[PDB]
Design a protein around this ligand. Structure first.
Ligand SMILES: NC(=O)C1=CN([C@@H]2O[C@H](COP(=O)(O)OP(=O)(O)OC[C@H]3O[C@@H](n4cnc5c(N)ncnc54)[C@H](OP(=O)(O)O)[C@@H]3O)[C@@H](O)[C@H]2O)C=CC1
Ligand SMILES: NC(=O)C1=CN([C@@H]2O[C@H](COP(=O)(O)OP(=O)(O)OC[C@H]3O[C@@H](n4cnc5c(N)ncnc54)[C@H](OP(=O)(O)O)[C@@H]3O)[C@@H](O)[C@H]2O)C=CC1
Lengths: 222, 223
């Protein structure tokens, strides 16, 4: 049996990924929401598929991160595949029009949060078999793609997590970890369920660390 | 007549850049220190070259950044060449080993600081002739270079600011701004603060196109 950790599973790509993993046999899923009590569809999935364990996590909240290791541990001794999917996208457009608060909130939720979350959960991941570590990033975070769009604090947060993900891939190569940053697509437009089907196949198959990948398995430049 | 603005001019490259400009014919220089009152080299520099103006700036401190345009406005109608030089470099090595505060301090000092600084001085830069914007970055900030080192919060912060620098260049291109990310070199191969300064002042004056990521010598770096 394999255990997957997905942050931000209450909706979007995250929910579709949990819904996709719940169908697979022998996949325990630790699914997080800021507010489980309100996570109607996730909770109904967990009611039907007890493979699916729901836990609270606010990745902006250090006090929430300080508890995620012990709380995930109640449901599993190990994590095979870790997915940092929870993230905000609330700041686009020009630098001069981006208030301080937006830079900060993208930093805390999109950069420090995934990093702290990986720090807290690394031990559980070390004790797993797959040792796979995915940060759901964006093609917007690329330092070398031009979309002729301003991504402001959003893109800046994804470039930052990209930089530290590539560094992490190097640090955990000797421990036989697979680390990737993955663009889940434009949800050309695709549905969250399409994204999750592609993402899930990618999680399964990827067998080399340090990749910046799109959902379809092709590579993006950092 | 040109106004240069330089953050962190009390020591390091920043002092060496201000020292060189203060010898330059018809150049006014707003130089910043966290603590003007103990920036004794720079106070003597401005005493001996009063074209040099010393104002308080803590780029980690939003209250300090909220005052910079008024502080700068005391001495000048405009900024021709803006240099975000002030910055920290306190955290390297593995992710698992980088505590929360190092990631936080490098974001606030090395990313938000320069963004808020530029937001505050853009009206004065807009009013100037040269419209030249330099963020002192690092080669460690590249997403496409491998020095066989991890740079932790430091590298992340330079990469972060690098992303926004590139965006700012796109955004201000039609306002005829020249925006550049510039690696000043590894300063005391090792080079001297005065060598860095000399090469930077040369780049500051000759740089004609925007959106570039440059080393001190004027070679391009990959984003
Ligand atoms: N959709 C797209 O086109 C693209 C998306 N992405 C990436 O895809 C991932 C998910 O996107 P998508 O499903 O569309 O996003 P949604 O906005 O649909 O949902 C985001 C998820 O993140 C959770 N989340 C947000 N803030 C926090 C927080 N502080 N603590 C914990 N959980 C939080 C949300 O919970 P809550 O309901 O509580 O807000 C939700 O579960 C992200 O990593 C994003 O960066 C990037 C490229 C393109
Ligand atoms: N120099 C190098 O070899 C390399 C460094 N860089 C870049 O070059 C820049 C210049 O380096 P250098 O001047 O020698 O740096 P130093 O290491 O000597 O010190 C940092 C400088 O920034 C100031 N400073 C630090 N923190 C703050 C703050 N919170 N608010 C305001 N000012 C602050 C310091 O003033 P104070 O005395 O008060 O601390 C000092 O002038 C760096 O800041 C960095 O971005 C990048 C690549 C290589």
């Amino acid at each position: 049996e394999q255990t997957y950790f997905i942050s931000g599973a209450n909706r979007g790509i995250g929910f579709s990924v949990v819904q996709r993993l719940a169908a697979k046999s022998g996949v325990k899923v630790i699914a997080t929401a800021r507010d489980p009590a309100s996570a109607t569809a996730l909770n109904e999935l967990a009611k039907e598929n007890p493979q699916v364990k729901v836990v609270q996590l606010d990745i902006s909240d250090e006090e929430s991160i300080k508890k995620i290791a012990k709380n995930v541990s109640q449901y599993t001794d190990s994590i095979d595949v870790f997915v940092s999917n929870a993230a905000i996208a609330k700041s686009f457009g020009p630098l001069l029009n981006t208030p301080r608060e937006q830079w900060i909130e993208h930093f805390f939720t999109n950069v420090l949060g995934p990093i702290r979350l990986f720090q807290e959960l690394y031990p559980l991941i070390k004790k797993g078999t797959q040792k796979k570590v995915f940060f759901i990033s964006s093609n917007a975070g690329s330092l070398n793609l031009d979309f002729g769009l301003d991504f402001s604090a959003f893109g800046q947060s994804k470039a930052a997590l990209n930089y530290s993900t590539k560094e992490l891939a190097r640090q955990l190569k000797p421990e036989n970890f697979i680390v990737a940053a993955v663009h889940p697509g434009k949800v050309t437009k695709i549905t969250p369920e399409e994204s999750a089907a592609a993402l899930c196949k990618l999680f399964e198959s990827l067998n080399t660390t340090g990749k910046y990948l799109s959902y379809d398995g092709t590579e993006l430049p950092w």
